[model samples]
Target: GSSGSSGTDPGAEELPARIFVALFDYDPLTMSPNPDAAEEELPFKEGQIIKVYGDKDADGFYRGETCARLGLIPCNMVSEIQADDEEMMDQSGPSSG
Candidate 1:
Protein backbone atom coordinates (compact mmCIF):
# COMPACT_ATOMS: atom_id res chain seq x y z
CA GLY A 1 0.00 0.00 0.00
CA SER A 2 2.14 2.91 1.19
CA SER A 3 5.00 1.83 -1.07
CA GLY A 4 5.84 -0.89 1.49
CA SER A 5 5.48 1.34 4.53
CA SER A 6 1.89 0.49 5.43
CA GLY A 7 1.23 0.18 9.18
CA THR A 8 -2.23 -1.35 9.11
CA ASP A 9 -2.79 -5.04 9.68
CA PRO A 10 -3.22 -6.55 6.24
CA GLY A 11 -4.32 -9.95 7.58
CA ALA A 12 -2.20 -13.11 7.67
CA GLU A 13 -1.71 -14.91 4.36
CA GLU A 14 -0.10 -17.84 6.13
CA LEU A 15 -0.03 -18.87 9.77
CA PRO A 16 1.60 -21.49 11.93
CA ALA A 17 -0.28 -24.19 13.79
CA ARG A 18 0.53 -22.67 17.16
CA ILE A 19 -1.09 -19.29 17.73
CA PHE A 20 -0.96 -16.79 20.57
CA VAL A 21 -2.78 -13.69 21.73
CA ALA A 22 -1.29 -10.50 23.06
CA LEU A 23 -2.13 -10.02 26.72
CA PHE A 24 -0.97 -6.39 26.55
CA ASP A 25 -0.25 -3.80 23.93
CA TYR A 26 3.25 -3.81 22.39
CA ASP A 27 5.02 -0.86 20.86
CA PRO A 28 6.64 -1.13 17.45
CA LEU A 29 10.26 -2.31 17.57
CA THR A 30 12.54 0.59 16.67
CA MET A 31 15.65 -1.32 15.66
CA SER A 32 16.80 -4.62 14.20
CA PRO A 33 19.92 -6.26 12.80
CA ASN A 34 18.60 -5.86 9.29
CA PRO A 35 17.84 -2.19 9.47
CA ASP A 36 18.12 -2.12 5.71
CA ALA A 37 15.16 -4.45 5.46
CA ALA A 38 11.87 -2.73 4.71
CA GLU A 39 9.84 -4.60 7.35
CA GLU A 40 8.23 -2.41 9.97
CA GLU A 41 7.45 -3.40 13.52
CA LEU A 42 3.89 -4.71 13.60
CA PRO A 43 2.27 -3.00 16.52
CA PHE A 44 -0.42 -4.95 18.29
CA LYS A 45 -3.03 -4.18 20.91
CA GLU A 46 -4.14 -6.18 23.89
CA GLY A 47 -6.06 -9.37 23.11
CA GLN A 48 -4.73 -9.40 19.56
CA ILE A 49 -4.02 -12.93 18.34
CA ILE A 50 -0.98 -13.68 16.19
CA LYS A 51 0.58 -16.83 14.76
CA VAL A 52 3.95 -17.94 16.13
CA TYR A 53 6.33 -19.55 13.70
CA GLY A 54 9.89 -20.85 14.08
CA ASP A 55 11.97 -21.01 17.23
CA LYS A 56 12.60 -18.06 19.51
CA ASP A 57 15.89 -16.22 19.58
CA ALA A 58 18.32 -16.38 22.48
CA ASP A 59 16.90 -13.06 23.63
CA GLY A 60 13.42 -14.65 23.85
CA PHE A 61 12.11 -12.96 20.74
CA TYR A 62 9.81 -14.82 18.37
CA ARG A 63 8.98 -14.34 14.73
CA GLY A 64 5.26 -13.83 14.37
CA GLU A 65 3.00 -12.78 11.56
CA THR A 66 -0.03 -10.65 12.23
CA CYS A 67 -2.19 -8.48 10.02
CA ALA A 68 -0.05 -9.76 7.15
CA ARG A 69 3.12 -8.26 8.56
CA LEU A 70 5.93 -10.54 9.71
CA GLY A 71 8.19 -9.25 12.45
CA LEU A 72 9.88 -10.12 15.68
CA ILE A 73 7.83 -9.91 18.87
CA PRO A 74 8.66 -10.24 22.53
CA CYS A 75 7.80 -13.70 23.88
CA ASN A 76 6.69 -12.34 27.24
CA MET A 77 4.09 -10.10 25.66
CA VAL A 78 1.83 -12.85 24.36
CA SER A 79 0.44 -16.10 25.75
CA GLU A 80 0.31 -19.34 23.85
CA ILE A 81 -3.04 -20.87 23.07
CA GLN A 82 -3.08 -24.51 24.10
CA ALA A 83 -4.75 -26.49 21.39
CA ASP A 84 -7.50 -28.80 22.58
CA ASP A 85 -5.94 -31.92 24.09
CA GLU A 86 -8.50 -33.90 22.16
CA GLU A 87 -6.81 -32.85 18.93
CA MET A 88 -3.33 -33.46 20.34
CA MET A 89 -3.07 -37.13 21.22
CA ASP A 90 -0.50 -38.09 23.82
CA GLN A 91 2.45 -39.66 22.10
CA SER A 92 3.76 -41.62 25.09
CA GLY A 93 1.30 -44.47 24.68
CA PRO A 94 -2.37 -45.47 25.02
CA SER A 95 -4.21 -43.72 27.83
CA SER A 96 -4.35 -45.71 31.03
CA GLY A 97 -8.13 -45.26 30.90
Candidate 2:
Protein backbone atom coordinates (compact mmCIF):
# COMPACT_ATOMS: atom_id res chain seq x y z
CA GLY A 1 0.00 0.00 0.00
CA SER A 2 1.14 3.60 -0.83
CA SER A 3 -0.10 6.99 0.39
CA GLY A 4 0.33 10.30 -1.47
CA SER A 5 0.29 13.81 0.03
CA SER A 6 0.37 17.16 -1.70
CA GLY A 7 0.54 20.70 -0.28
CA THR A 8 0.81 24.26 -1.60
CA ASP A 9 3.99 26.17 -0.78
CA PRO A 10 4.10 29.80 0.20
CA GLY A 11 6.07 32.35 -1.75
CA ALA A 12 8.92 34.26 -0.14
CA GLU A 13 8.10 37.83 0.78
CA GLU A 14 10.08 40.79 -0.42
CA LEU A 15 12.36 42.79 1.82
CA PRO A 16 11.61 46.26 3.12
CA ALA A 17 11.92 49.15 0.66
CA ARG A 18 14.22 51.12 2.93
CA ILE A 19 17.45 49.18 3.16
CA PHE A 20 20.85 50.47 4.25
CA VAL A 21 24.24 49.05 5.00
CA ALA A 22 26.43 50.25 7.87
CA LEU A 23 29.36 52.38 6.82
CA PHE A 24 31.00 52.60 10.23
CA ASP A 25 31.22 50.74 13.50
CA TYR A 26 29.01 52.01 16.31
CA ASP A 27 30.24 51.63 19.87
CA PRO A 28 27.66 52.30 22.59
CA LEU A 29 30.32 52.28 25.29
CA THR A 30 31.86 55.47 23.87
CA MET A 31 28.60 57.29 23.27
CA SER A 32 26.27 56.53 26.16
CA PRO A 33 26.70 56.76 29.92
CA ASN A 34 23.73 54.75 31.16
CA PRO A 35 24.43 51.04 31.14
CA ASP A 36 20.87 50.24 30.17
CA ALA A 37 20.86 52.76 27.36
CA ALA A 38 23.15 50.53 25.39
CA GLU A 39 20.65 47.74 25.57
CA GLU A 40 18.18 49.68 23.46
CA GLU A 41 20.76 50.90 20.98
CA LEU A 42 21.59 48.50 18.19
CA PRO A 43 25.29 47.91 17.80
CA PHE A 44 26.36 47.20 14.21
CA LYS A 45 29.67 46.67 12.52
CA GLU A 46 30.94 48.20 9.30
CA GLY A 47 29.46 46.68 6.12
CA GLN A 48 26.50 45.24 8.00
CA ILE A 49 23.05 45.64 6.47
CA ILE A 50 20.32 47.28 8.58
CA LYS A 51 16.58 47.45 7.98
CA VAL A 52 15.19 50.89 8.74
CA TYR A 53 11.65 50.93 10.08
CA GLY A 54 10.40 54.41 9.22
CA ASP A 55 11.53 57.94 8.57
CA LYS A 56 14.34 59.55 10.49
CA ASP A 57 13.38 61.29 13.70
CA ALA A 58 14.06 64.93 14.62
CA ASP A 59 17.33 63.89 16.23
CA GLY A 60 18.52 62.37 12.94
CA PHE A 61 18.19 58.81 14.19
CA TYR A 62 16.59 55.95 12.31
CA ARG A 63 14.88 53.05 14.00
CA GLY A 64 16.63 50.11 12.41
CA GLU A 65 17.30 46.45 13.08
CA THR A 66 20.44 44.40 12.56
CA CYS A 67 21.78 41.14 13.87
CA ALA A 68 18.27 40.36 15.20
CA ARG A 69 18.27 43.48 17.44
CA LEU A 70 16.22 46.65 17.12
CA GLY A 71 17.50 50.10 18.10
CA LEU A 72 18.09 53.66 17.04
CA ILE A 73 20.83 54.03 14.48
CA PRO A 74 22.60 57.18 13.39
CA CYS A 75 21.59 58.25 9.90
CA ASN A 76 25.01 59.57 9.07
CA MET A 77 26.72 56.27 9.86
CA VAL A 78 24.73 54.21 7.37
CA SER A 79 24.34 54.59 3.64
CA GLU A 80 21.07 53.90 1.89
CA ILE A 81 21.04 51.39 -0.89
CA GLN A 82 19.82 52.81 -4.18
CA ALA A 83 17.49 50.11 -5.36
CA ASP A 84 16.38 52.11 -8.39
CA ASP A 85 19.77 52.94 -9.72
CA GLU A 86 20.86 50.95 -12.78
CA GLU A 87 24.05 52.88 -13.59
CA MET A 88 26.02 51.76 -10.54
CA MET A 89 28.45 49.77 -12.63
CA ASP A 90 31.20 52.36 -12.20
CA GLN A 91 31.86 51.27 -8.63
CA SER A 92 31.85 47.56 -9.46
CA GLY A 93 35.55 46.94 -9.39
CA PRO A 94 37.40 43.79 -10.36
CA SER A 95 37.64 41.03 -7.76
CA SER A 96 41.04 39.87 -6.57
CA GLY A 97 41.41 36.13 -6.30
Candidate 3:
Protein backbone atom coordinates (compact mmCIF):
# COMPACT_ATOMS: atom_id res chain seq x y z
CA GLY A 1 0.00 0.00 0.00
CA SER A 2 3.03 2.21 0.19
CA SER A 3 6.01 2.56 -2.00
CA GLY A 4 7.19 4.81 0.75
CA SER A 5 10.26 6.93 -0.01
CA SER A 6 13.68 6.21 -1.35
CA GLY A 7 17.07 7.22 0.13
CA THR A 8 17.65 8.73 3.52
CA ASP A 9 14.67 10.23 5.31
CA PRO A 10 15.24 13.62 6.82
CA GLY A 11 14.13 14.47 10.40
CA ALA A 12 14.19 10.74 11.18
CA GLU A 13 17.75 11.12 12.39
CA GLU A 14 20.97 12.97 11.77
CA LEU A 15 23.15 11.13 9.33
CA PRO A 16 26.88 10.91 9.89
CA ALA A 17 29.11 13.48 8.21
CA ARG A 18 30.61 11.52 5.38
CA ILE A 19 33.13 13.12 3.04
CA PHE A 20 34.04 12.36 -0.57
CA VAL A 21 36.48 13.77 -3.12
CA ALA A 22 35.68 14.55 -6.72
CA LEU A 23 37.70 12.40 -9.04
CA PHE A 24 36.47 14.33 -12.08
CA ASP A 25 34.40 17.26 -13.14
CA TYR A 26 30.62 17.03 -12.81
CA ASP A 27 28.58 19.64 -14.62
CA PRO A 28 24.94 19.18 -13.74
CA LEU A 29 24.04 21.27 -16.76
CA THR A 30 25.79 18.97 -19.21
CA MET A 31 24.64 15.73 -17.63
CA SER A 32 21.22 14.37 -18.54
CA PRO A 33 18.57 12.90 -16.31
CA ASN A 34 14.89 12.03 -16.33
CA PRO A 35 13.12 15.15 -17.49
CA ASP A 36 10.35 14.70 -14.98
CA ALA A 37 12.38 13.62 -11.99
CA ALA A 38 12.84 15.91 -9.02
CA GLU A 39 16.58 16.06 -8.58
CA GLU A 40 18.97 18.86 -7.80
CA GLU A 41 22.28 19.41 -9.55
CA LEU A 42 25.56 20.73 -8.26
CA PRO A 43 28.79 21.42 -10.11
CA PHE A 44 31.84 19.55 -8.90
CA LYS A 45 35.40 20.33 -9.89
CA GLU A 46 38.13 17.75 -9.77
CA GLY A 47 39.63 17.29 -6.30
CA GLN A 48 36.67 19.04 -4.71
CA ILE A 49 35.30 17.67 -1.46
CA ILE A 50 31.67 16.92 -0.77
CA LYS A 51 29.74 15.83 2.25
CA VAL A 52 27.32 12.93 1.70
CA TYR A 53 24.40 12.14 3.90
CA GLY A 54 23.38 8.60 2.93
CA ASP A 55 21.86 6.21 0.39
CA LYS A 56 23.75 5.28 -2.76
CA ASP A 57 21.66 4.65 -5.88
CA ALA A 58 21.97 1.35 -7.68
CA ASP A 59 22.64 3.37 -10.82
CA GLY A 60 25.89 4.64 -9.29
CA PHE A 61 24.48 7.94 -8.20
CA TYR A 62 24.49 9.42 -4.71
CA ARG A 63 22.81 12.42 -3.09
CA GLY A 64 25.17 14.86 -1.48
CA GLU A 65 26.21 18.46 -1.14
CA THR A 66 29.23 20.70 -1.63
CA CYS A 67 29.41 24.18 -0.17
CA ALA A 68 25.78 25.31 0.09
CA ARG A 69 24.56 23.42 -2.96
CA LEU A 70 22.84 20.05 -2.83
CA GLY A 71 22.47 17.61 -5.71
CA LEU A 72 22.99 14.16 -7.16
CA ILE A 73 26.43 13.05 -8.29
CA PRO A 74 27.73 9.92 -9.96
CA CYS A 75 29.12 7.54 -7.36
CA ASN A 76 32.20 7.06 -9.49
CA MET A 77 32.65 10.80 -9.77
CA VAL A 78 33.75 10.90 -6.18
CA SER A 79 35.67 8.59 -3.90
CA GLU A 80 35.89 8.40 -0.16
CA ILE A 81 39.30 9.79 0.79
CA GLN A 82 40.28 8.50 4.18
CA ALA A 83 42.88 10.40 6.11
CA ASP A 84 45.13 7.37 6.49
CA ASP A 85 44.88 6.55 2.82
CA GLU A 86 45.94 10.07 1.95
CA GLU A 87 48.87 9.85 4.29
CA MET A 88 49.91 6.54 2.80
CA MET A 89 49.65 7.91 -0.73
CA ASP A 90 51.74 10.92 0.18
CA GLN A 91 54.37 8.72 1.76
CA SER A 92 54.53 6.43 -1.24
CA GLY A 93 54.41 9.09 -3.95
CA PRO A 94 57.62 10.09 -5.73
CA SER A 95 59.48 12.77 -3.87
CA SER A 96 62.23 15.23 -4.70
CA GLY A 97 65.47 13.42 -4.00
Q: Could you say which candidate leads in TM-score?
A: 2
Candidate 2, superposed: residue stretches over 4 Å from native: 1-10, 14-17, 84-97
TM-score of 2: 0.65
Model 3 clash pairs are none
Per-residue lDDT value at 68 in model 3: 63
| Alpha-carbon RMSD to native, per candidate | 7.6, 10.9, 10.1
* Evaluation by lDDT, superior candidate among 2 and 3: 2
Lowest lDDT 10-mer window, candidate 2?
1-10
Of 1 and 2, the candidate ranking higher by TM-score = 2
**Candidate 1: clashing residue pairs, number:** 3
How far out, in Å, is residue 66 in model 1?
0.1
Q: In model 1, which regions exceed 4 Å deviation?
A: 1-16, 29-41, 85-97
lDDT at 45 for candidate 3?
Answer: 94
List, in order, the clash count of every candidate structure.
3, 0, 0
Which candidate model has the greater TM-score, 1 or 3?
3
